Design a protein around this ligand. Structure first.
Ligand SMILES: NC(=O)c1ccc[n+]([C@@H]2O[C@H](COP(=O)([O-])OP(=O)(O)OC[C@H]3O[C@@H](n4cnc5c(N)ncnc54)[C@H](OP(=O)(O)O)[C@@H]3O)[C@@H](O)[C@H]2O)c1
Ligand SMILES: NC(=O)c1ccc[n+]([C@@H]2O[C@H](COP(=O)([O-])OP(=O)(O)OC[C@H]3O[C@@H](n4cnc5c(N)ncnc54)[C@H](OP(=O)(O)O)[C@@H]3O)[C@@H](O)[C@H]2O)c1
Lengths: 248, 248
């Protein structure tokens, strides 16, 4: 029985793999950097010798890549699916690189939608399955100079909040949860601005570590809440219900 | 000086074209059905003989099609650009057809974002320019049995509210606005559920006509408001500022 983590090679996804390793889970680790994946597998195996680990070097910004990934995993007994892979961009709309933004839409929205839909299709009446989508506090609150990114996270928030409440109204066994982290110390900002070495310690007053966020992720799965969100003012992690208006 | 209307071959975008023709506007009308576009052009020319009308039979669910479209109109004086083309789907996530949902993302989110981005890049400091993105009350309110579509309208809402406030803080001359219609008598229902014939008169208790929505759209342009949103209870058209939290 497997937990699937896209974007496992660094950051939130990486620390989540090490946490579920310590809980003895078997994992499917997806990302492009095979070198990083094989590195994380070794740590998983050292943490948890009897945990089986499958790697998938896959660029999820391509739509058939996404379909092929899920088709390759149907042989498997998946209890948890985590759409963690995701990139930002810090730029005015007038200055964006259309190709980077397009890649972002395809990763942040499409891959997550395709994978959520296929998983929902196949696991909606299977007891004990969970679907976790990673959004951001920026999916509930627009941040200046990250308009296009925030909009992809509002999509993930509204998508997953609606899907969660759809499954509840339908008595589905599958559970669907959305995580909304705040400043988390990952490679997200370096990747977003295109240059490495941004120092959270020196530049950001409030932020969680990736290992902390992996724990909040684990709390969310182990709970009845649809939303696990970091409050922007207190920086507390709160398990709670949907934030967006629902017509049901 | 031209107003670009995507999804002009029916519904809101069509009635808008006629309304603007009655104002003497020149029009770029984009859609797939050349049949419906030519017919509209005849009607526009009868309304307004000296209005120039350019037709563009384009499928905007293809990202290269979207790019080609903008590049073909870079030789025009565009004052207003209206991202109106969009489709819905009524279905549980577990039942969606992956292809229709994917095209919906490509149309509702990507095309709108690509055309929004290029227009902003080229027009932000051109006096008297306006960008209008057509969301829905479903972009501020999740609706059961339409989770994915709502999600795409939440994206359109957050993106355009973000962009609008971005341009304001920067002293742009370009104005960005979002229209959030409620039940609007168009082909939208038929296209979502894949068969023709849905009767608003007999099935929907509250709804605007497509001509009414064209009027709210026009009043939105003739306003200093970022959001024009129909109230779901009273069905009043309200011109107001953003609805989502902004961190600026
Ligand atoms: N960090 C924060 O402050 C923060 C705040 C709110 C939300 N988030 C959300 O956190 C999630 C995790 O990101 P992170 O903060 O941990 O950042 P990160 O350290 O940059 O990790 C991003 C992950 O996504 C993978 N990825 C990126 N593009 C990919 C692609 N095209 N195909 C496949 N995998 C791809 C990366 O691996 P490869 O490079 O190997 O492909 C990596 O494993 C994201 O969804 C992000 O939006 C983060
Ligand atoms: N009607 C409502 O209840 C309601 C409420 C809120 C929001 N809205 C929004 O209103 C907007 C306009 O739709 P409508 O309600 O007027 O419905 P509609 O009558 O179906 O019009 C949609 C338009 O989009 C065009 N279109 C669809 N797919 C396209 C594609 N792939 N490429 C290019 N053009 C495409 C259609 O023309 P072709 O098929 O000829 O290409 C048509 O002109 C949409 O954004 C919709 O979400 C509608």
């Amino acid at each position: 029985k497997y937990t699937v983590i896209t974007g496992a090679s660094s950051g939130i996804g990486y620390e989540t793999a090490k946490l579920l390793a310590g809980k003895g889970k078997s994992l499917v680790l997806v990302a492009r950097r095979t070198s990083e994946l094989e590195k994380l597998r070794d740590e998983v195996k050292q943490i948890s010798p009897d945990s089986d680990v499958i790697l998938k070097s896959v660029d999820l910004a391509d739509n058939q890549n996404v379909h092929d990934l899920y088709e390759g995993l149907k042989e498997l007994d998946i209890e948890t699916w985590i759409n963690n892979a995701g990139v930002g961009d810090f730029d005015l709309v007038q200055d964006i690189e259309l190709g980077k933004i397009e890649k972002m839409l395809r990763l942040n929205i499409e891959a997550l939608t395709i994978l959520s839909s296929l998983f929902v299709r196949d696991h909606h009446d299977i007891e004990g399955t969970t679907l976790v989508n990673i959004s951001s506090l920026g999916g509930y609150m627009i941040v200046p100079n990250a308009v296009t990114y925030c909009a992809t996270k509002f999509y993930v928030s509204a998508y997953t909040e609606g899907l969660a409440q759809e499954l509840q109204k339908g008595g589905a066994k599958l559970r669907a949860k959305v995580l909304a982290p705040a400043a988390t110390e990952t490679e997200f900002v370096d990747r977003a601005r295109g240059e490495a070495g941004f120092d959270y310690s020196k530049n950001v007053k409030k932020y969680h570590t990736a290992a902390e966020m992996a724990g909040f992720l684990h709390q969310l799965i182990e709970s009845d809440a649809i939303v696990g969100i970091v409050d922007g003012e207190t920086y507390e992690f709160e398990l709670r219900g949907p934030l967006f208006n629902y017509a049901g």
